[PDB]
Design a binder for these strands. Structure first.
Lengths: 168, 174
RNA sequence: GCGAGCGUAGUUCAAUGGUAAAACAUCUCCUUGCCAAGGAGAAGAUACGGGUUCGAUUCCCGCCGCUCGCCCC
């Protein structure tokens, strides 16, 4: 069910970090995070990051509970290739239809380039704006890099051991 | 004992660092890249020449001089038979080439390797006008060996004036 | 040996599961003849091999060579 945009807090509580790594990490995190939600068509507000020798917090305000369910026009094969002079459309048209699960009548012609185009309208599969973060955060956290690193109980590279994660 | 290659290597390294320093205050890369291939000996001279030539390049007349000075340069490459001799006043053709040679002799007095660029274009502007008439009315095509050699030598010595001030190859206008 | 990054006209570079784009250099030509200056065209390419799909410069794997750490020093 749809609600209202509420705050989003991410904290990675580690042990003591060098004075010349908090500055780098608090930027590498926020700059790369204000991009993923744009990739996943999320709507945020004022994003700000904070650093401390024991935590690297990022606060994003007014994050919606849903994605923007909108239709997008794809770009299929050239019209000449997919449609013959006479008869039924060639194998490319049916392959496109069965790939995107759309009726044949939905195809329309728009003029661009030498061969004009073949175009179709498809949905975007709006999720619940929480599974996306669940599946994406393990990459945004692990995308940080440092000049020096170590391991404590696994094969994960980080500047200092991580002791807790507070993602709300 | 150190061979003579190490000193050249060090000079090249210092020149490459000087270029990096000079491109740090907003100087165009193609300008310093052209100045430093000829003024790399004294760093202060290079720094005071490349900081001023860029400022002069906005006089709206800079492309005119760039086009004219080295329009002759692109024919030099190829045949080198004309480098054997120099100019003379015996086999000279109609008064167009004589006027161009006189203008060249007049302008060569103010151009020496110890000059700066302040009066460079102001003295080179007078040479441009006879150049068009020359290239349009002499037919520098090599039909006679003597006249071809003489014309090639005259053209090379005309185009060799900036040898000592700056080069016009890495020039953007080209 | 052990990791990463790579590979597109001669050089520099565009894009994404689908008829390969642009500058520059070369060439063919139209201006009065040779360079400059205006125009038109031509040719020019995905390092290599395989797999799947109707179809990959794009996804997976093998190899070639380059660049950087580590190994050695």
């Amino acid at each position: 069910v749809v609600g209202q945009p509420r705050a989003f807090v991410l904290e990675i509580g580690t042990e003591e970090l060098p004075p010349h790594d908090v500055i780098e990490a608090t930027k590498q995190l926020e700059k790369s995070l204000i991009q993923i939600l744009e990739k996943r068509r999320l709507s945020h507000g004022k994003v700000r990051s904070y650093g401390t020798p024991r935590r690297l917090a990022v606060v994003v305000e007014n994050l919606n509970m849903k994605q923007m369910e909108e239709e997008i026009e794809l770009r299929g094969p050239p019209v000449a290739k997919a449609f013959d002079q006479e008869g039924r459309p060639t194998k490319a048209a049916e392959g496109f239809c069965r790939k995107n699960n759309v009726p044949i009548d939905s195809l329309y012609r728009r003029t661009d380039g030498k061969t004009e185009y073949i175009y179709a309208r498809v949905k975007e599969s709006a999720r619940f704006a929480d599974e996306v973060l669940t599946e994406d955060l393990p990459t945004i956290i692990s995308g940080i890099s440092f000049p020096k690193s170590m391991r404590w109980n696994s094969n994960i590279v980080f500047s200092r051991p991580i002791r807790w994660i507070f993602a709300l | 004992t150190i061979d003579s290659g190490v000193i050249d290597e060090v000079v090249q390294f210092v020149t490459r660092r000087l270029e990096q320093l000079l491109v740090d205050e907003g100087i165009n890369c193609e300008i310093v890249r052209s100045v430093l291939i000829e003024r790399a000996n004294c760093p202060y001279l290079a720094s005071q020449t490349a900081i001023e030539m860029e400022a002069f390049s906005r006089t709206e007349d800079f492309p005119k001089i760039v086009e004219a000075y080295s329009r002759p340069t692109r024919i030099i490459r190829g045949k080198e038979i004309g480098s054997a001799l120099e100019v003379d006043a015996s086999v000279f053709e109609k008064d167009e080439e004589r006027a161009l040679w006189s203008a060249y002799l007049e302008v060569a007095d103010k151009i020496h390797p110890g000059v700066d660029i302040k009066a460079f274009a102001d003295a080179s502007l007078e040479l441009l006008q006879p150049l068009e008439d020359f290239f349009t009315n002499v037919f520098v095509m090599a039909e006679d060996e003597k006249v071809r050699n003489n014309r090639l030598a005259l053209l090379t010595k005309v185009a060799s004036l900036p040898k000592g001030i700056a080069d016009l190859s890495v020039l953007p206008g080209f």
